[PDB]
Amino acid sequence: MNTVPFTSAPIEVTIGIDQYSFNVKENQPFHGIKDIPIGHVHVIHFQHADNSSMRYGYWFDCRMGNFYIQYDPKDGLYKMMEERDGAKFENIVHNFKERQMMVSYPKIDEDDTWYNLTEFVQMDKIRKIVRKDENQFSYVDSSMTTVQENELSDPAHSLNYTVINFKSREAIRPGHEMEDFLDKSYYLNTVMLQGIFKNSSNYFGELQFAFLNAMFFGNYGSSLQWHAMIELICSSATVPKHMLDKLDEILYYQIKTLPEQYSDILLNERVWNICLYSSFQKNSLHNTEKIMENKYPELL
Amino acid sequence: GAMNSSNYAELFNNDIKLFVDDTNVYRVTVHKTFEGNVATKAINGCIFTLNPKTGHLFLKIIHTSVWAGQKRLSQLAKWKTAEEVSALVRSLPKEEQPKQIIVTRKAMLDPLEVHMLDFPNIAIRPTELRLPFSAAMSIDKLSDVVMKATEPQMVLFNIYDDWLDRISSYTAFSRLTLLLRALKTNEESAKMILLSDPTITIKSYHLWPSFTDEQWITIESQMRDLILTEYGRKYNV
Ligand SMILES: NCc1nccn1Cc1ccccc1
Numbered sequence: 001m002n003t004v005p006f007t008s009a010p011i012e013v014t015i016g017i018d019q020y021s022f023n024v025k026e027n028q029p030f031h032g033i034k035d036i037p038i039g040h041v042h043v044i045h046f047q048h049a050d051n052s053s054m055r056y057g058y059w060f061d062c063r064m065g066n067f068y069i070q071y072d073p074k075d076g077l078y079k080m081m082e083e084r085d086g087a088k089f090e091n092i093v094h095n096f097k098e099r100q101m102m103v104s105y106p107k108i109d110e111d112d113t114w115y116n117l118t119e120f121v122q123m124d125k126i127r128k129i130v131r132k133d134e135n136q137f138s139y140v141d142s143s144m145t146t147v148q149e150n151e152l153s154d155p156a157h158s159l160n161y162t163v164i165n166f167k168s169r170e171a172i173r174p175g176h177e178m179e180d181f182l183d184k185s186y187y188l189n190t191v192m193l194q195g196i197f198k199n200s201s202n203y204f205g206e207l208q209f210a211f212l213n214a215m216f217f218g219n220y221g222s223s224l225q226w227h228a229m230i231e232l233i234c235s236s237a238t239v240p241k242h243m244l245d246k247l248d249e250i251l252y253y254q255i256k257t258l259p260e261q262y263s264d265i266l267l268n269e270r271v272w273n274i275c276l277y278s279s280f281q282k283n284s285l286h287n288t289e290k291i292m293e294n295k296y297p298e299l300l
Numbered sequence: 301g302a303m304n305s306s307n308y309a310e311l312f313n314n315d316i317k318l319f320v321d322d323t324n325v326y327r328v329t330v331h332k333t334f335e336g337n338v339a340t341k342a343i344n345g346c347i348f349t350l351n352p353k354t355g356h357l358f359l360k361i362i363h364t365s366v367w368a369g370q371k372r373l374s375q376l377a378k379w380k381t382a383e384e385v386s387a388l389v390r391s392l393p394k395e396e397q398p399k400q401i402i403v404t405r406k407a408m409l410d411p412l413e414v415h416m417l418d419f420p421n422i423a424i425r426p427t428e429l430r431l432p433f434s435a436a437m438s439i440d441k442l443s444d445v446v447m448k449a450t451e452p453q454m455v456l457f458n459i460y461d462d463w464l465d466r467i468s469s470y471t472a473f474s475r476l477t478l479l480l481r482a483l484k485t486n487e488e489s490a491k492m493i494l495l496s497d498p499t500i501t502i503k504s505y506h507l508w509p510s511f512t513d514e515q516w517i518t519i520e521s522q523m524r525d526l527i528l529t530e531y532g533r534k535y536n537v
Contacts, residue, residue: 167410169417177414178379 002062003093003102004044005032006078007070012049013078016057016216018042018114019257020106023049031101032069034093036062040118041126043140044069045216046078055217056141061123064136068092080137116253117212120205129160129209140213146221159221161210162196164228166235183280185238192232200243203229204250211254214266227271234275234282244284251288255295263296273300303402303427311352312469317400318358320385321348321433322408324446325362326377342367346446347381348436349388351398353469355460359442360384361449382411388454389419398422404431432480438487441507461506466513475520479508482523485530493522 004017012026017033024030026049036042045057058080060067065082066089072079083089096102107114123136130138146159165171171187172180180186197203207229213222233239233247258266276282276289277300293300303310311317325347328340345362366380367373389397400423403412413424437443445455460472467475482490500509511519531537 167413167417172414172417177383178376178411181410181414 016045031096034102060137185236188236234279237280321404322381323434357457382415386415435480435484438483
């Protein structure tokens with residue numbers, strides 16, 4: 001069980017860790033988050049009480065280093081940093097635990113939500129989507145744009161998701177125009193799975209990361225990307241049997257975890273109605289269709 | 301963007317453009333099987349591809365053999381249309397290729413866009429105008445060459461005959477759309493107006509009769525009456 005200590009909390013902020021969150025008051029004696037489950041990526045994230053504009057946060061994996069948070073009054077945000085001195089850190093953490101100034105990552109033992117939302121998400125792939133190789137952790141916020149969004153402006157601050165475009169030469173074999181447009185299996189299985197992602201695990205990891213950035217930061221380009229990766233599978237007539245089964249599990253936990261009060265912006269009517277009711281895989285998403293119907297029958 | 305009443309003069313500027321109408325590509329005569337069920341039999345069709353400034357019609361005849369053993373023909377027809385239009389553009393010299401293609405039905409947008417991915421700077425546009433190009437098969441010489449085709453075949457016509465010697469493109473397009481709108485609303489009466497007078501002939505190399513300017517005004521008037529009338533016979537006004 002690992003720990004992310006905080007130097008202090010000088011400004012009032014709502015702090016999230018994965019799907020959990022708590023309110024910290026201005027200069028309340030908060031000094032971090034303990035008992036963080038090892039073996040998964042995690043995201044710590046922030047919404048200042050004053051300017052709810054800009055949700056922002058940090059993706060990280062405690063196996064790759066000791067990380068802490070410290071507020072910067074110049075740049076006006078809680079920054080993640082790496083401590084390179086092991087004994088300094090354990091001592092900080094031990095002293096902070098001794099005075100019980102840390103919250104406990106509040107995981108129910110019965111609960112596999114986080115595992116299921118991050119099953120295929122690896123820090124190595126996050127660090128390629130979010131480029132900043134001088135840090136072992138990755139910053140993301142509400143406003144960051146995707147590579148594909150910038151094509152249609154600061155590259156160092158972009159989300160380098162894989163570009164998907166259904167009316168593109170990469171998507172459409174010369175001579176198979178109608179075939180490839182109406183059945184995207186070529187583009188899914190040859191171009192993307194075999195060519196770009198190499199395997200479905202890496203495809204699912206990007207899909208899941210894109211969803212998580214859409215949900216936790218309201219990142220619009222991430223939401224676009226999540227839906228495009230769903231549509232590309234649902235619009236392929238030929239999908240490996242294991243991918244279809246796993247996709248249903250993946251989407252199920254994403255829709256289960258979505259705030260009920262956010263489905264107006266984060267869910268694309270056209271994509272879901274096509275995916276569940278008109279596409280090749282309309283019948284292969286029983287659990288996802290089931291929870292979408294009992295929970296968001298309005299959108300449909 | 302979309303083409304409408306507001307930007308109508310753009311059709312006659314000096315940027316090459318083509319209208320593409322697919323309404324006569326897939327044509328059937330639905331009938332009854334011996335078992336009392338219903339079958340379609342296809343007949344030959346055509347793509348109607350028109351330069352509105354010059355009057356150049358590229359009439360691609362769609363022979364019924366193209367449908368043999370195919371499924372979902374109404375959907376295939378849009379993709380076949382797009383395949384043929386893209387092939388036409390590729391066949392033209394660069395300086396003759398259009399800058400824009402305006403499809404008369406929105407269902408042609410994605411098929412044409414996908415076939416023209418090699419041509420990123422050719423704009424594919426829909427229109428809000430309800431143009432009467434379906435009625436092209438009411439022009440006897442066009443109907444005749446489509447029905448007689450025994451193989452795929454491109455036929456090249458000026459749909460304005462020699463009108464551009466005497467009138468502008470704007471005026472020629474307006475005359476064309478009035479004639480076709482009339483043929484579409486009451487083909488029989490429309491053809492009566494055009495052929496009523498045995499002294500007026502159609503040149504072997506033309507589609508429409510050789511009317512003087514004054515006779516064209518009389519004809520055009522008679523065509524407007526018909527279109528209003530039929531608007532009253534249908535709407536009882
Ligand atoms: N060659 C038949 C003909 N008749 C009149 C004009 N033309 C040439 C032409 C070229 C392209 C399209 C349409 C017409």
